[PDB]
Amino acid sequence: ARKKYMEISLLTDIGQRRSNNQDFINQFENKAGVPLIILADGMGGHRAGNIASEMTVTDLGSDWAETDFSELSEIRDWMLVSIETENRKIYELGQSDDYKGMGTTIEAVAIVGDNIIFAHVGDSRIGIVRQGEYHLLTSDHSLVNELVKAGQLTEEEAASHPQKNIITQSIGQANPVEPDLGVHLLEEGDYLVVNSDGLTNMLSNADIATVLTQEKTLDDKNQDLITLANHRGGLDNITVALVYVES
Ligand SMILES: [Mg+2]
Ligand SMILES: [Mg+2]
Fold it and tell me: What's the 238 CA to ligand 2 centre distance in angstroms?
């Protein structure tokens, strides 16, 4: 019950080094006017990553469009439920054709007034940029983060771990998924930054904060983010949702 005008910008890019974009991103709006942004990073050889990412985003968002709710707790019930049905829908689909290792990350973000609530599965990320500073909101579901949490690495040690991130859960797996949820307040001038790993593997947090500090449109800033990610190497698909909170 605190109306803020908010600008949303979506962009996806294949990257310099890849010939297939298995990321998917889209926005939706339910019958009560509540926007939802869904970003998904798919994995799996010849089109299994494409299918999983586009299916999750399209199915959830199409179901979202038919809903009625305007409260956080109702939206939260919806996220926990829909993600489990999509998890078993993609696993089943992974089994019945021979799709080796089909799965996707998810970030699902709904904006109620000036609050956001997210559901998060994988190594995609959500951050807030305020007064030139990036605040990380999600924790990567990765091998190195499990080692920290069990007391086998320090946080400093994981930051310089030499192996690539092996994901520990994704949508389309046999066991039920455990998504992370979070409610946060957005302040005037903030930027919500929702991205797949292709942004943040190539750019530092402060680099992202730098791009968004300029006086340019949101759409131009999002273009600058992927251009920079490509200049740094572009080794993976880059996909970003930006939300700016108007003053
Ligand atoms: Mg992928
Ligand atoms: Mg990726």
Answer: 7
**Which residues lie at CB < 5 A from ion ligand 1?**
22, 41-43
Between CA 128 and CA 191 the distance in angstroms is 6
Tell me how far the alpha carbon of residue 22 lies from the centroid of ligand 2, in angstroms.
Answer: 8
Domain extent for 102? 1-247
**Rounded to the nearest whole angstrom, what is the distance from the C-alpha of residue 134 to the centroid of ligand 1?**
24
Helix (H) or strand (E) holding 239: strand 238-245
- Ligand with smallest separation from the Cα of 196: 2
Tokens 């997210």: give the residue: 118
Domain count, the chain: 1
- The Å distance, Cα 72 to ligand 2 centre, comes to 29
User: Which has the closest alpha carbon to 142: 126, 156, 157, 158?
Assistant: 158
C-alpha of residue 21 to centroid of ligand 1, in Å: 8
Q: What is the CATH number of the domain that holds 216?
A: 3.60.40.10
Q: Which region, left, alpha or beta, applies to residue 226 given φ > 0 means left and ψ of -120 to 50 means alpha?
A: alpha
Best CA proximity match to 42, nearest among 64, 28, 60, 57: 57
Resolution (A): 2.7
Sheet containing 6-13: give its strands across. Answer: 6-13, 238-245, 191-195, 125-130, 133-136
**Beta-strand runs (E) in 125-213:** 125-130, 133-136, 180-185, 191-195
